Write a protein that binds this ligand. Structure first.
Ligand code: PB
Ligand code: PB
Ligand code: PB
Ligand code: PB
Ligand code: ZN
Ligand code: ZN
Length: 187
């Protein structure tokens, strides 16, 4: 089901339904679909699937707590969303314990260029503090953009207190940024 996008001027802050970031500019900040009301950046049109009136792929992870250490294995991901005009992305994963208002906990994988099916095969250790029992492990995939802001691709999270009781291992469905801070969907 194809979309029919036309230029639009937005009178209140509106975000791109494809890549997540603000539609900016004095006028004509994005493209709106005549049928379903989807709003995207001009440069995102090419990557929007034909789902008018009708996902983000999946990631394979392990996360296990031993003593006071949370150890995360970031293997690979499949069927990710393209964020660049060539119909690909340059994905990396950012891991942190949230809430993190001082931005202290983040760690990241390397960037895999030009793919929707990256393999990282990297692992990360977090030394847990007592207050981390109330936090969540956040896992976010982003498209690296060299000269513009990086683009959100998909995410999920696990409760630290839950990981203490039961390690995680398997495929997980990638979620939007807001849902991903609070939920995960095993596959
Ligand atoms: Pb973009
Ligand atoms: Pb991009
Ligand atoms: Pb890119
Ligand atoms: Pb960008
Ligand atoms: Zn549409
Ligand atoms: Zn966009």
């Amino acid at each position: 089901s194809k979309h029919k996008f036309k230029i639009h001027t937005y009178g209140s802050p509106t975000f791109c339904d494809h890549c997540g970031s603000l539609l900016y500019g004095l006028i004509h900040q994005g493209m709106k679909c005549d049928t379903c009301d989807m709003n995207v950046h001009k440069q995102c049109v090419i990557n929007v699937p034909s789902l008018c009136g009708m996902k983000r792929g999946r990631i394979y992870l392990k996360a296990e707590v031993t003593d006071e250490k949370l150890h995360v294995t970031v293997r690979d991901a499949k069927n990710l969303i393209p964020m660049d005009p060539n119909g690909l992305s340059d994905p990396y994963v950012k891991l942190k314990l949230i809430p993190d208002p001082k931005n202290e906990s983040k760690q990241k994988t390397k960037t895999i260029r030009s793919t929707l099916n990256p393999q990282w095969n990297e692992s990360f250790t977090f030394k847990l503090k007592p207050s981390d029992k109330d936090r969540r492990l956040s896992v976010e995939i982003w498209d690296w953009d060299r000269t513009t802001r990086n683009d959100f691709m998909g995410s999920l999270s696990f409760g630290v207190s839950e990981l203490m009781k039961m390690p995680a291992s398997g495929w997980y469905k990638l979620l939007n940024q807001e849902e991903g801070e609070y939920y995960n969907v095993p596959i």
